[PDB]
Design an enzyme around this catalytic site. Structure first.
Site, PDB file in Angstrom:
ATOM      1  N   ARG A 155       0.234  -3.056  -1.003  1.00  0.00           N
ATOM      2  CA  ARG A 155       1.083  -2.071  -1.693  1.00  0.00           C
ATOM      3  C   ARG A 155       2.430  -1.894  -1.021  1.00  0.00           C
ATOM      4  O   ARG A 155       2.494  -1.368   0.105  1.00  0.00           O
ATOM      5  CB  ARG A 155       0.335  -0.732  -1.911  1.00  0.00           C
ATOM      6  CG  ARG A 155       1.130   0.375  -2.637  1.00  0.00           C
ATOM      7  CD  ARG A 155       0.273   1.584  -2.939  1.00  0.00           C
ATOM      8  NE  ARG A 155      -0.078   2.362  -1.748  1.00  0.00           N
ATOM      9  CZ  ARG A 155      -0.830   3.457  -1.809  1.00  0.00           C
ATOM     10  NH1 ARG A 155      -1.304   3.870  -2.995  1.00  0.00           N
ATOM     11  NH2 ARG A 155      -1.115   4.148  -0.696  1.00  0.00           N
ATOM     12  N   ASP A 416      -2.367  11.104   3.084  1.00  0.00           N
ATOM     13  CA  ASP A 416      -1.196  10.247   2.967  1.00  0.00           C
ATOM     14  C   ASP A 416      -0.076  11.077   2.343  1.00  0.00           C
ATOM     15  O   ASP A 416      -0.248  12.286   2.106  1.00  0.00           O
ATOM     16  CB  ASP A 416      -1.529   8.983   2.144  1.00  0.00           C
ATOM     17  CG  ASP A 416      -1.859   9.288   0.706  1.00  0.00           C
ATOM     18  OD1 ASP A 416      -1.712  10.440   0.291  1.00  0.00           O
ATOM     19  OD2 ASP A 416      -2.240   8.348  -0.037  1.00  0.00           O
TER      20      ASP A 416
HETATM   21 MG   LIG Z   1      -0.449   6.985  -4.957  1.00  0.00          MG
END
Ligand SMILES: [Mg+2]
Ligand SMILES: [Mg+2]
Length: 501
Positions: A155, A416
């Site tokens: 990602r 996160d």
């Molecule tokens: Mg996300």
């Protein structure tokens, strides 16, 4: 002319050949990226003026047509459990060895975008693909990879982030293009030789045109290194309210390079709040109460499953066990964990309910999700605890991030940036809303926020210690406070955070 600004083994990733490829990426696609970000601002004006996302008339033909994504590689057929983690050397190994079917190696939300992390990330992934990656402990231990690992998927940063440490004619490079470009350049051919491929997790998109941009990047990239079109496989994180109205269109723009979609919680609820922040009725309860069974989230998941399976693509997803069990029963082809230890849990549920490699054959024909289903505001309470949690987790997460650790274990949840985003976003909304009142009736005011903020900061210093402090809590506190006090709503905390990181 390309300038490399960051401090500098980095020479091995930043080779003249690799850089020439990044330069061409930039010249071809950065301006389009900037244009699309400008289109987002224009769309926000339309939403502010009462024009909600809708199923587009202009793209009806794509939706009525009977195409499917191109055929998936075998190593993308069974995705029952995926684990996510940053591109930190030790975490990469633990995630690859976790028993997950796939590992989404993260340059984005769980990665603090330091120059060191961005380039060391690539070194680490390059070594992982080669099999030479190792993490050495001072006690002598040296962790390495199982001979068969989870399938690697990367990602990159989303379209709104820049890599300020490399420039082309004075203009910062796209973080996306850098993260994708270096991994692709250095690893596509090796991945192909081991019978896998260059696979990506594409974040935070708000429009199919942003999907087209990725597709055009892939086409150019494959041509550039001379592998065939249709080799790059990308899973789209369908994680913004805007995208829920363009799911089919998004898969279509990417169809030759598609590995389906993935549902989220926090980035999506964040997106919903951010988009409708000027709409008075879109007041949200404690984020904990906004679960996957909340009607608008239910509509979202089901529509993802129905859309994906229709195009022959995967749809990736006690209370944790009930939750995974719901996802499997609903038709998701797999689910996510953010820690090695939770793989068995997820694995058990899916192995019991989904004995087939996937359940793409489950079309969920009987359900009908309308635009109104997608937009329905969740009902609950706003609570002193939820408000304290938003403040505490927001600040602790941002301190961790400024300290270079974008994957933060807080109250043993692996947090996160999306956690911090919904955290700051809720406080911003609750201070402002006329309905922004605790369960006990107290008005959520700047004063109360500030007083609760001081108490939580006292509590943190007690859990963590004075010295820890060195964790950039002062700066984290200032940034969080600016984020909730500023009336304008910064689109992403990482935008101002990147400046001061
Ligand atoms: Mg996300
Ligand atoms: Mg309004």
């Amino acid at each position: 002319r390309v300038t490399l600004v960051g401090e500098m083994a980095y020479n091995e990733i930043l080779t003249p050949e690799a850089l020439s490829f990044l330069k061409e990426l930039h010249e071809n696609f950065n301006e389009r990226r900037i244009e699309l970000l400008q289109k987002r601002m224009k769309k926000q004006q339309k939403i502010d003026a009462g024009e909600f996302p809708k199923f587009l008339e202009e793209t009806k033909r794509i939706r009525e047509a009977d195409w499917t994504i191109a055929k998936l590689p075998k190593d993308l057929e069974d995705r029952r459990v995926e684990i996510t983690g940053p591109v930190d050397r030790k975490m990469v190994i633990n995630a690859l060895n976790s028993g997950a079917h796939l590992f989404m190696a993260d340059f984005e939300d769980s990665n603090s975008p330091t120059w060191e992390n961005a380039i060391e990330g690539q070194i680490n992934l390059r070594d992982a693909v080669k099999g030479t990656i190792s993490h050495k402990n001072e006690n002598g231990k040296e962790y390495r990879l199982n001979s068969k690992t989870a399938v690697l998927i990367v990602r990159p940063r989303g379209w709104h982030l820049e890599e300020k440490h490399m420039q082309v004619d004075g203009k910062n490079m796209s973080g996306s293009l850098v993260d994708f470009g270096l991994y692709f350049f250095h690893n596509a051919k090796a991945l192909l030789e081991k019978g896998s491929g260059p696979y990506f997790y594409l974040p935070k998109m708000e429009s199919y045109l942003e999907a087209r941009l990725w597709n055009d990047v892939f086409v150019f990239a494959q041509k550039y290194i001379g592998i065939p079109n249709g080799t790059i496989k990308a899973t789209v994180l369908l994680e913004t309210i805007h995208a829920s109205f363009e799911m089919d269109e998004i898969l279509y723009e990417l169809k030759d390079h598609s590995a389906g979609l993935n549902c989220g919680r926090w980035d999506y609820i964040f997106s919903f709040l951010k988009a409708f922040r000027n709409h008075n009725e879109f007041l949200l309860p404690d984020r904990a109460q906004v679960t996957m069974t909340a009607p608008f989230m239910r509509a979202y998941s089901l529509k993802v499953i129905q859309t994906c399976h229709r195009r022959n693509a995967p749809a990736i997803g006690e209370k944790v066990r009930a939750d995974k069990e719901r996802e499997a029963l609903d038709g998701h082809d797999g689910t996510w964990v953010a820690h090695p230890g939770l793989v068995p849990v997820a694995m058990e549920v899916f192995n019991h309910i989904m004995k087939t490699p996937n359940q793409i054959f489950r079309k969920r024909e009987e359900i009908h999700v309308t635009e109104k289903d997608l937009l329905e505001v969740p009902v609950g309470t706003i609570t002193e605890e939820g408000l304290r949690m938003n403040i505490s987790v927001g600040i602790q997460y941002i301190a961790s991030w400024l300290s270079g650790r974008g994957a933060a274990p807080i109250y043993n949840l692996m947090e996160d940036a999306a956690t911090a985003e919904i955290s700051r976003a809720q406080v911003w909304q609750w201070i402002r809303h006329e309905g922004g009142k605790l369960n006990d009736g107290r008005n959520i005011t700047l004063e109360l926020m500030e007083e609760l903020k001081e108490e939580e900061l006292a509590k943190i210093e007690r859990e963590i210690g004075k010295e820890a402090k060195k964790g950039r809590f002062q700066e984290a506190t200032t940034l969080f406070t600016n984020l909730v006090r500023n009336d304008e709503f910064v689109p992403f905390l990482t935008l101002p955070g990147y400046e001061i990181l």
